[PDB]
Scaffold this motif. Structure first.
Motif, PDB file in Angstrom:
ATOM      1  N   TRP A  66      58.807  68.022  51.349  1.00  0.00           N
ATOM      2  CA  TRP A  66      59.910  68.002  50.383  1.00  0.00           C
ATOM      3  C   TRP A  66      59.636  66.804  49.476  1.00  0.00           C
ATOM      4  CZ3 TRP A  66      61.599  72.587  51.829  1.00  0.00           C
ATOM      5  CH2 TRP A  66      61.438  72.940  53.182  1.00  0.00           C
ATOM      6  N   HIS A  67      59.043  67.078  48.324  1.00  0.00           N
ATOM      7  CA  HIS A  67      58.315  66.045  47.597  1.00  0.00           C
ATOM      8  C   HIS A  67      59.253  65.075  46.880  1.00  0.00           C
ATOM      9  CE1 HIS A  67      54.983  64.486  45.015  1.00  0.00           C
ATOM     10  NE2 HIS A  67      56.082  64.011  44.457  1.00  0.00           N
ATOM     11  N   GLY A  68      59.124  63.773  47.164  1.00  0.00           N
ATOM     12  CA  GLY A  68      60.039  62.752  46.620  1.00  0.00           C
ATOM     13  C   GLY A  68      61.373  62.504  47.346  1.00  0.00           C
ATOM     14  N   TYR A 109      58.922  71.330  46.569  1.00  0.00           N
ATOM     15  CA  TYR A 109      58.458  71.483  47.928  1.00  0.00           C
ATOM     16  C   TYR A 109      57.145  72.267  47.972  1.00  0.00           C
ATOM     17  CZ  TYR A 109      60.442  76.189  47.684  1.00  0.00           C
ATOM     18  OH  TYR A 109      60.687  77.471  47.379  1.00  0.00           O
ATOM     19  N   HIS A 110      56.283  71.949  48.936  1.00  0.00           N
ATOM     20  CA  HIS A 110      54.986  72.614  49.032  1.00  0.00           C
ATOM     21  C   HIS A 110      54.424  72.529  50.448  1.00  0.00           C
ATOM     22  CE1 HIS A 110      52.981  68.635  48.742  1.00  0.00           C
ATOM     23  NE2 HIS A 110      53.872  68.373  47.802  1.00  0.00           N
ATOM     24  N   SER A 111      53.543  73.467  50.795  1.00  0.00           N
ATOM     25  CA  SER A 111      52.732  73.345  52.006  1.00  0.00           C
ATOM     26  C   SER A 111      52.034  72.002  51.985  1.00  0.00           C
ATOM     27  CB  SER A 111      51.674  74.443  52.096  1.00  0.00           C
ATOM     28  OG  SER A 111      50.887  74.282  53.279  1.00  0.00           O
ATOM     29  N   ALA A 243      49.821  65.973  38.152  1.00  0.00           N
ATOM     30  CA  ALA A 243      50.174  66.778  39.314  1.00  0.00           C
ATOM     31  C   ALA A 243      51.298  66.175  40.106  1.00  0.00           C
ATOM     32  CB  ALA A 243      48.959  67.034  40.203  1.00  0.00           C
ATOM     33  N   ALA A 244      52.285  67.011  40.426  1.00  0.00           N
ATOM     34  CA  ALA A 244      53.461  66.615  41.223  1.00  0.00           C
ATOM     35  C   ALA A 244      54.528  65.726  40.519  1.00  0.00           C
ATOM     36  CB  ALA A 244      53.042  66.028  42.573  1.00  0.00           C
ATOM     37  N   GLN A 245      54.289  65.330  39.274  1.00  0.00           N
ATOM     38  CA  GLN A 245      55.332  64.667  38.465  1.00  0.00           C
ATOM     39  C   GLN A 245      56.439  65.593  37.949  1.00  0.00           C
ATOM     40  OE1 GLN A 245      53.121  62.528  35.447  1.00  0.00           O
ATOM     41  NE2 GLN A 245      52.823  60.749  36.804  1.00  0.00           N
TER      42      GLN A 245
HETATM   43 CU   LIG Z   1      53.997  66.557  46.776  1.00  0.00          CU
END
Ligand SMILES: [Cu+2]
Ligand SMILES: [Cu+2]
Ligand SMILES: [Cu+2]
Ligand SMILES: [Cu+2]
Length: 495
Positions: A66-68, A109-111, A243-245
């Motif tokens: 769960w990114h960030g 969210y990502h693997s 990437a991912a920002q």
């Molecule tokens: Cu991420």
């Protein structure tokens, strides 16, 4: 579609053809991108992930990040495989149960197993603030105003080689786009606006690799949020998004009714917009249904420069106003050689026992922890400084820290540090050779926290270390449910 904060999320295989080319995928919630997971600040999220994967080509195990999301007290729910948990096996489920106090804004969210998120398991995650200080700047903020940018590959992630320069086969905007080579006239995504309305556009990079030069013909963009952090208003006409920002930007639909190109030029893969690659459509209600014929400005005159961003809040910068003005200041040697990346001479290779389980089992120091030389311990309540001097094979590397956001004390392509009012974010370009991008945060979150380049192929190539923050307090701060403890026995038994 929006789901949450309490929701099921099934992880399935599906063939999809977003650019006209069918191939296998690993999907969260049945769709590409995954459904938007949403809640309000301070909400309890309970995401029951059912692993129903069958196609080994892309791995039938899975683990979701769960990114960030800081995950304070819930390090176990963070997602990075063999850092905070073993993967969930096909046939099982697992409940990611966590809170998001203090955080609002645009996430994803990502693997977080191998390179699996390239194969499709990626989606947006939005935490709405019912008292958003930015609210008055726009009329519309909803599912229709989320914009994802995705690199898409015709080659399965597991077969990429590696690394080894790897390039995408198209750019997908809201999940549709055209193939870079032998471009077929397949459907483009549309973003619909109404003359005179202002939109909170939530621009999410769900990229496995490329950064994008993002622009909208004829239109301005006013940035108000960066990686979850409310920013002062900054009007630009182009955004390089790595990437991912994430950025939220206000779009003021003030142009004549018509069709305008939305452009996202990757730094590798197809260059330009021929046949409508790297494109989506901004369509005004009342426009003819036709492709735009607009052109980009020959020169963008106000492109995003990261040093122009400043927090809306008085975040300041922790510690002392000179390099190493921290309680624990670090400078990492970042290298590439012979197809693998190194941090301080060690390439990351995932341990058999997750770093969190190692700590729970009795490990007390970095020296106790595997992988050897791939863990740096951090003391609690300390100002950390991390310099990340660039130079390693391409590049530009977007570095990301789990369980924390950070002050960007020094940005890409600018050797002047800012100890007054730099933006805070969670993923940052460390720029180019001779740069010295530097970040600061405070250790207020015990747990093993991943630090890696968010170019997934580089992560798989070992560009990662773990900050084991407050190892002595890690077990007491992060009590685990039995389902977590069941993960590694189930996983190891199946393999
Ligand atoms: Cu991420
Ligand atoms: Cu993360
Ligand atoms: Cu990288
Ligand atoms: Cu990560």
């Amino acid at each position: 579609v929006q789901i949450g904060p309490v929701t099921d999320l099934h992880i399935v295989n599906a063939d999809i053809v977003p650019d006209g080319f069918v191939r296998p995928a690993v999907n969260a919630g049945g769709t590409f991108p995954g459904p938007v997971i949403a809640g309000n600040v301070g909400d309890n999220f309970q995401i029951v992930t059912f692993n129903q994967l069958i196609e080994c080509s892309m791995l039938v195990d899975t683990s979701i990040h769960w990114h960030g999301e800081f995950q304070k007290g819930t390090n176990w729910a963070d997602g990075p495989a063999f850092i905070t948990q073993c993967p969930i096996i096909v046939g099982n489920s697992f409940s990611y149960n966590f809170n998001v106090p203090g955080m609002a804004g645009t996430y994803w969210y990502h693997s977080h197993l191998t390179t699996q998120y390239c194969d499709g398991l990626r989606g947006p995650f939005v935490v709405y603030d019912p008292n958003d200080p930015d609210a008055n700047l726009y009329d519309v903020d909803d599912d229709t105003t989320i914009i994802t940018l995705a690199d898409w590959y015709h080659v399965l992630a597991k077969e990429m080689g590696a690394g080894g320069a790897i390039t995408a086969d198209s750019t997908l905007i809201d999940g549709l786009g055209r193939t870079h080579v032998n471009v077929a006239a397949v459907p483009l995504s549309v973003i619909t606006v109404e003359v005179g309305k202002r939109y909170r556009m939530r621009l999410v990079s769900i990229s496995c690799d490329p950064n994008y030069d993002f622009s909208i013909d004829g239109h301005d963009m006013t940035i108000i949020e960066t990686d979850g952090v409310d920013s002062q208003e900054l009007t630009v006409d182009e955004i390089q998004i790595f990437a991912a920002q994430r950025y939220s930007f206000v779009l003021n639909a003030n142009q004549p009714v018509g069709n305008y190109w939305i452009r996202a030029n990757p730094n590798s893969g197809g260059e330009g917009f021929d046949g409508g690659i790297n494109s989506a459509i901004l369509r005004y209600d009342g426009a003819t249904t036709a492709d735009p014929v607009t052109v980009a400005s020959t020169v963008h005159t106000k492109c995003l420069i990261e040093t122009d961003l400043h927090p809306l809040s008085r975040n300041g910068v922790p510690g002392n106003p000179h390099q190493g003005g921290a309680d624990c200041n670090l400078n990492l040697s970042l290298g590439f050689a012979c197809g693998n990346f190194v941090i301080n001479g060690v390439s990351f290779t995932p341990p058999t026992v997750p770093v969190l389980l190692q700590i729970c089992s009795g490990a007390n120091t970095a020296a106790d922890l595997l992988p050897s030389g791939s863990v740096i311990s951090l003391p609690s309540n300390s100002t950390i400084e991390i310099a990340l001097p660039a130079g390693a094979a391409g590049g530009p590397h977007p570095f990301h820290l789990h369980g924390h956001d950070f002050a960007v004390s020094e940005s890409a392509s600018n050797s002047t540090s800012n100890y007054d009012d730099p933006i805070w974010r969670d993923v940052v370009s460390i720029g180019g050779v001779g740069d010295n991008v530097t970040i600061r945060f405070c250790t207020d979150n015990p747990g093993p926290w991943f630090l890696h380049c968010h170019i997934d192929w580089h992560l798989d190539a070992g560009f990662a270390i773990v900050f084991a923050e407050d190892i002595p307090n890690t077990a007491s701060a992060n009590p685990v449910p039995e389902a977590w403890s069941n993960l590694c026995p189930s996983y190891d038994s199946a393999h």
